[PDB]
Amino acid sequence: CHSFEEKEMEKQRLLYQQARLHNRGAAEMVLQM
C-alpha cells in the first residue's frame, strides 16, 4: 500500500490500493489479531 493534479492522482491511487485490501476483510482480521 506504499501540482494539484499530481496530488489528486496520488490520493486516488492510494485509495484504490487501500480498497483492494479493505474490500476483502482486512480490518476485522486486524482487530481480531
Curated annotation (Swiss-Prot):
Belongs to the ryanodine receptor (TC 1.A.3.1) family. RYR1 subfamily. Cytosolic calcium-activated calcium channel that mediates the release of Ca(2+) from the sarcoplasmic reticulum into the cytosol and thereby plays a key role in triggering muscle contraction following depolarization of T-tubules. Repeated very high-level exercise increases the open probability of the channel and leads to Ca(2+) leaking into the cytoplasm. Can also mediate the release of Ca(2+) from intracellular stores in neurons, and may thereby promote prolonged Ca(2+) signaling in the brain. Required for normal embryonic development of muscle fibers and skeletal muscle. It is found in: Sarcoplasmic reticulum membrane. Channel activity is modulated by phosphorylation. This is Ryanodine receptor 1. It comes from Sus scrofa (Pig). The chain holds residues 3729 to 3777 of 5035 of the full protein. The calcium release channel activity resides in the C-terminal region while the remaining part of the protein constitutes the 'foot' structure spanning the junctional gap between the sarcoplasmic reticulum (SR) and the T-tubule. Pore opening is mediated via the cytoplasmic calcium-binding domains that mediate a small rotation of the channel-forming transmembrane regions that then leads to channel opening. The lineage of its organism: Eukaryota, Metazoa, Chordata, Craniata, Vertebrata. Homotetramer. Can also form heterotetramers with RYR2. Identified in a complex composed of RYR1, PDE4D, PKA, FKBP1A and protein phosphatase 1 (PP1). Repeated very high-level exercise decreases interaction with PDE4D and protein phosphatase 1 (PP1). Interacts with CALM; CALM with bound calcium inhibits the RYR1 channel activity. Interacts with S100A1. Interacts with FKBP1A; this stabilizes the closed conformation of the channel. Interacts with CACNA1S; interaction with CACNA1S is important for activation of the RYR1 channel. Interacts with CACNB1. The gene is RYR1. It comes from the Eukaryota.
